Design an enzyme around this catalytic site. Structure first.
Site, mmCIF file in Angstrom:
data_model
loop_
_atom_site.group_PDB
_atom_site.id
_atom_site.type_symbol
_atom_site.label_atom_id
_atom_site.label_comp_id
_atom_site.label_asym_id
_atom_site.label_seq_id
_atom_site.Cartn_x
_atom_site.Cartn_y
_atom_site.Cartn_z
ATOM 1 N N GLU A 62 -26.662 -18.196 51.068
ATOM 2 C CA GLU A 62 -27.479 -19.331 50.867
ATOM 3 C C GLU A 62 -28.127 -19.411 49.457
ATOM 4 O OE1 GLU A 62 -31.434 -20.430 52.565
ATOM 5 O OE2 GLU A 62 -30.423 -22.181 53.284
ATOM 6 N N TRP A 84 -25.836 -25.517 56.981
ATOM 7 C CA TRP A 84 -26.413 -26.594 56.494
ATOM 8 C C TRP A 84 -25.280 -27.541 57.079
ATOM 9 C CZ3 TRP A 84 -30.498 -28.365 53.646
ATOM 10 C CH2 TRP A 84 -31.324 -27.644 52.830
ATOM 11 N N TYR A 110 -32.245 -28.440 47.644
ATOM 12 C CA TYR A 110 -32.844 -27.268 46.831
ATOM 13 C C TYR A 110 -32.053 -26.813 45.408
ATOM 14 C CZ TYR A 110 -35.604 -26.033 50.726
ATOM 15 O OH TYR A 110 -36.505 -25.758 51.707
ATOM 16 N N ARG A 151 -48.789 -20.493 35.573
ATOM 17 C CA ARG A 151 -48.289 -21.665 35.993
ATOM 18 C C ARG A 151 -46.692 -21.576 36.140
ATOM 19 N NH1 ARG A 151 -50.256 -23.075 30.574
ATOM 20 N NH2 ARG A 151 -52.527 -23.899 30.891
ATOM 21 N N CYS A 170 -38.420 -27.532 53.256
ATOM 22 C CA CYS A 170 -39.591 -26.754 53.955
ATOM 23 C C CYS A 170 -40.240 -25.883 53.102
ATOM 24 C CB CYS A 170 -39.037 -25.914 55.208
ATOM 25 S SG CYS A 170 -38.971 -26.331 56.751
ATOM 26 N N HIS A 171 -39.694 -25.416 52.160
ATOM 27 C CA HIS A 171 -39.986 -24.430 50.987
ATOM 28 C C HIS A 171 -40.422 -25.608 49.787
ATOM 29 C CE1 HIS A 171 -37.309 -22.005 53.380
ATOM 30 N NE2 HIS A 171 -38.589 -21.795 53.695
ATOM 31 N N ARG A 190 -44.132 -25.579 54.097
ATOM 32 C CA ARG A 190 -44.927 -26.521 54.939
ATOM 33 C C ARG A 190 -44.687 -26.228 56.277
ATOM 34 N NH1 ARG A 190 -41.788 -29.975 57.120
ATOM 35 N NH2 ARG A 190 -39.345 -30.081 56.275
ATOM 36 N N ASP A 193 -40.760 -22.328 61.889
ATOM 37 C CA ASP A 193 -40.479 -22.092 63.202
ATOM 38 C C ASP A 193 -40.486 -20.366 63.292
ATOM 39 O OD1 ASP A 193 -38.730 -21.339 65.263
ATOM 40 O OD2 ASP A 193 -37.123 -22.771 64.854
ATOM 41 N N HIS A 231 -45.374 -22.619 63.662
ATOM 42 C CA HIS A 231 -45.362 -22.930 65.056
ATOM 43 C C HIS A 231 -44.053 -21.991 65.918
ATOM 44 C CE1 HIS A 231 -42.736 -25.692 62.725
ATOM 45 N NE2 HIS A 231 -41.858 -25.547 63.655
ATOM 46 N N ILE A 232 -44.694 -22.091 67.211
ATOM 47 C CA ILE A 232 -43.480 -21.242 68.192
ATOM 48 C C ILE A 232 -43.048 -22.555 68.964
ATOM 49 C CG2 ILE A 232 -43.329 -19.675 69.834
ATOM 50 C CD1 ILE A 232 -45.355 -18.188 68.523
ATOM 51 N N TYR A 233 -41.793 -22.559 69.228
ATOM 52 C CA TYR A 233 -41.120 -23.505 70.195
ATOM 53 C C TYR A 233 -41.434 -22.925 71.547
ATOM 54 C CZ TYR A 233 -39.295 -26.735 66.785
ATOM 55 O OH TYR A 233 -39.206 -27.721 65.707
HETATM 56 O O1 LIG Z 1 -35.720 -22.575 56.326
HETATM 57 C C1 LIG Z 1 -36.351 -23.545 57.003
HETATM 58 C C2 LIG Z 1 -35.674 -24.777 57.396
HETATM 59 C C3 LIG Z 1 -36.401 -25.450 58.847
HETATM 60 N N1 LIG Z 1 -37.455 -24.669 59.415
HETATM 61 C C4 LIG Z 1 -37.912 -25.462 60.689
HETATM 62 C C5 LIG Z 1 -39.617 -25.785 60.813
HETATM 63 C C6 LIG Z 1 -39.143 -26.874 62.039
HETATM 64 O O2 LIG Z 1 -39.203 -26.230 63.206
HETATM 65 C C7 LIG Z 1 -37.927 -27.354 61.289
HETATM 66 C C8 LIG Z 1 -38.082 -28.272 60.376
HETATM 67 O O3 LIG Z 1 -38.492 -29.635 60.992
HETATM 68 P P1 LIG Z 1 -39.554 -30.455 60.340
HETATM 69 O O4 LIG Z 1 -40.729 -29.593 59.835
HETATM 70 O O5 LIG Z 1 -39.059 -30.982 59.164
HETATM 71 O O6 LIG Z 1 -40.316 -31.310 61.190
HETATM 72 O O7 LIG Z 1 -37.380 -26.319 61.029
HETATM 73 C C9 LIG Z 1 -37.954 -23.313 59.074
HETATM 74 O O8 LIG Z 1 -38.723 -22.564 59.614
HETATM 75 N N2 LIG Z 1 -37.381 -22.478 58.087
HETATM 76 O O1 LIG Z 2 -59.796 -27.457 39.059
HETATM 77 C C1 LIG Z 2 -59.685 -26.496 38.287
HETATM 78 C C2 LIG Z 2 -59.087 -26.558 36.826
HETATM 79 C C3 LIG Z 2 -59.151 -25.136 36.201
HETATM 80 N N1 LIG Z 2 -59.550 -23.805 36.930
HETATM 81 C C4 LIG Z 2 -59.417 -22.612 36.304
HETATM 82 C C5 LIG Z 2 -58.651 -21.433 36.646
HETATM 83 C C6 LIG Z 2 -58.141 -21.039 35.295
HETATM 84 O O2 LIG Z 2 -59.113 -19.933 35.317
HETATM 85 C C7 LIG Z 2 -58.231 -22.306 34.289
HETATM 86 C C8 LIG Z 2 -56.904 -22.754 34.123
HETATM 87 O O3 LIG Z 2 -56.248 -22.215 33.229
HETATM 88 P P1 LIG Z 2 -54.470 -21.856 33.662
HETATM 89 O O4 LIG Z 2 -54.681 -21.468 35.131
HETATM 90 O O5 LIG Z 2 -53.830 -23.155 33.624
HETATM 91 O O6 LIG Z 2 -54.253 -20.712 32.730
HETATM 92 O O7 LIG Z 2 -59.295 -22.941 34.810
HETATM 93 C C9 LIG Z 2 -59.890 -23.996 38.286
HETATM 94 O O8 LIG Z 2 -60.468 -22.863 39.123
HETATM 95 N N2 LIG Z 2 -60.028 -25.031 39.114
#
Ligand SMILES: O=c1ccn([C@H]2C[C@H](O)[C@@H](COP(=O)(O)O)O2)c(=O)[nH]1
Ligand SMILES: O=c1ccn([C@H]2C[C@H](O)[C@@H](COP(=O)(O)O)O2)c(=O)[nH]1
Lengths: 285, 288
Positions: A62, A84, A110, A151, A170-171, A190, A193, A231-233
């Site tokens: 993958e 997939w 991705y 960054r 999800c990532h 986000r 599972d 989450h755990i199903y």
């Molecule tokens: O790489 C992956 C892809 C999917 N899921 C899981 C989380 C959820 O159980 C489901 C995705 O559903 P939603 O979060 O989109 O509703 O699959 C993962 O854990 N890892």
């Molecule tokens: O809302 C904000 C905006 C900036 N910073 C900080 C983190 C860094 O110290 C600097 C931003 O610099 P860079 O991470 O872009 O290098 O300002 C925060 O903590 N919160």
């Protein structure tokens, strides 16, 4: 002071003890916690879980498929990795309104986001050379020229492209960090599972970190796994309980078998998992 | 039940004890840890930090300014909040190669991304009505119609627009979550100045969660703060050591003073911080 695999098992225990009942789109039902974080050392060890066998071949194929920029499920399936395929099916695509889309065409998922963020998606066969932002190569270039940079991000979450995707990612993003010649990676996932997805996902991003560390001449540091809806199903609770009582074996090592210059040049045969000794597969859902 | 602010203070202590030296562009130096997470309850309390006074007026006016979609530093400065003015100045714009940009024009920053993600950015005066993705309103609508959704994300990180921005966003994205009629929010903050930025940033996202909870008829649950590069500038070490000696006072409450229907309708006078009792301001010099 729990490390390695115990972080993952501690998360499962926390959700079992403190998770709340929460339905999902499938109406299956879960126990759920919002916001978790675990740290996996990558220093002379590779976090492929041992309390149940992880689908390593899936992880590796993958990731190579993402790196090549592919959005074609057929190109991954041809490697024997079917994960997939259901999302690229004729029926599935039609259910989303994509009746004229060719089977396998996942949309701007991705591969596309990573290599061509912001380009206009057409279909999985189109030539996107030179179009959009190559976030993967930009990450690599930044690590090389300005390792202190705060960054160094690769972002798959593209609100403009979401309605075209077979599934939203999800990532959502990952961030890299360098200090003391070590490369660390944090994943913002986000939705997780814990039983079926998370072990696979940890190995994916640890592998990506090993790849980029190799390309940039750095040592792998930490993988930091951050979850949104962890989450755990409900039907995984009994299998996970069995799993939880298994003693972890030491993590394997990952060997990279030649010197590789460019991220695009890695092949599956370049990698060898050494000393992986998992307890047997546990079937879940 | 320990005071929520002890999480923030425990993070400072961890960085002082275990952070590693890591340079930045300003050559100030930091102590740095990668990957941290804290949880701040929003349930009948508002996590405005008490061991030093947080610039609440800045927090509130900046957020209203993001909500309006503005990318004009002058529009925030007119409210008495100068925090983005250095980044909009003729000198700073020219240092980035934006010599033909009008003073104040920050480029496609937070406001634009939240209300118009994916639109073509022209300038800070352009009418973007109907262009790009209104992520803020989509979040609100999803919470209303499908609170179980695991995709309720608002993302400011836009790789295509980065080279146009005056500064890349520190708050790369946030995610919302609903269970038991409570709304939680997690922020992914890629870079955190623990002394000067983080207290402000916690208050910003807790405030956003209170606003959206109010609009959607839900109660505020948790604010989960996740950091990438969490750092203390070397010249903040001594002031923070002073701060670390202070005992937190109970957090204030946030009151919303009328029923508000749409996120765009909130005004600064709609909000009242009740029972905020901070220890005095601690001066910490900003890096460059
Ligand atoms: O790489 C992956 C892809 C999917 N899921 C899981 C989380 C959820 O159980 C489901 C995705 O559903 P939603 O979060 O989109 O509703 O699959 C993962 O854990 N890892
Ligand atoms: O809302 C904000 C905006 C900036 N910073 C900080 C983190 C860094 O110290 C600097 C931003 O610099 P860079 O991470 O872009 O290098 O300002 C925060 O903590 N919160």
């Amino acid at each position: 002071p729990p490390h390695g695999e115990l972080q993952y098992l501690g998360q499962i225990q926390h959700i079992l003890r403190c998770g709340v009942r929460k339905d999902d789109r499938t109406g299956t039902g879960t126990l759920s916690v919002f916001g978790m974080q675990a740290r996996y050392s990558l220093r002379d060890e590779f976090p492929l879980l041992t309390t149940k066998r992880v689908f390593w071949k899936g992880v590796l194929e993958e990731l190579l498929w993402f790196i090549k920029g592919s959005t074609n499920a057929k190109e991954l399936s041809s490697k024997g990795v079917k994960i997939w395929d259901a999302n690229g099916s004729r029926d599935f695509l039609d259910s989303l309104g994509f009746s004229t889309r060719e089977e396998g065409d996942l949309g701007p998922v991705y591969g596309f986001q990573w290599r061509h963020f912001g380009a206009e998606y057409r279909d999985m066969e189109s030539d996107y050379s030179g179009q959009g932002v190559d976030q993967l190569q930009r990450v690599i270039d930044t690590i090389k020229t300005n390792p202190d940079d705060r960054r160094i991000i690769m972002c798959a979450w593209n609100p403009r492209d979401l309605p075209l995707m077979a599934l939203p990612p999800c990532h959502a993003l990952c961030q890299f960090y360098v200090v003391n010649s070590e490369l660390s990676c944090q994943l913002y996932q986000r939705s997780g599972d814990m039983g079926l997805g998370v072990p696979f996902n940890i190995a994916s991003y640890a592998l990506l970190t090993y790849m980029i560390a190799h390309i940039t001449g750095l040592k792998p540091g930490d993988f930091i796994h951050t979850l949104g809806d962890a989450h755990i199903y409900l039907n995984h609770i009994e299998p996970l309980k069995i799993q939880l009582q298994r003693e972890p074996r030491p993590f394997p090592k990952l060997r990279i078998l030649r010197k590789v210059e460019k991220i695009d040049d890695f092949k599956a045969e370049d990698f060898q998992i050494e000393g992986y000794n998992p307890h047997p597969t546990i079937k879940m859902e």
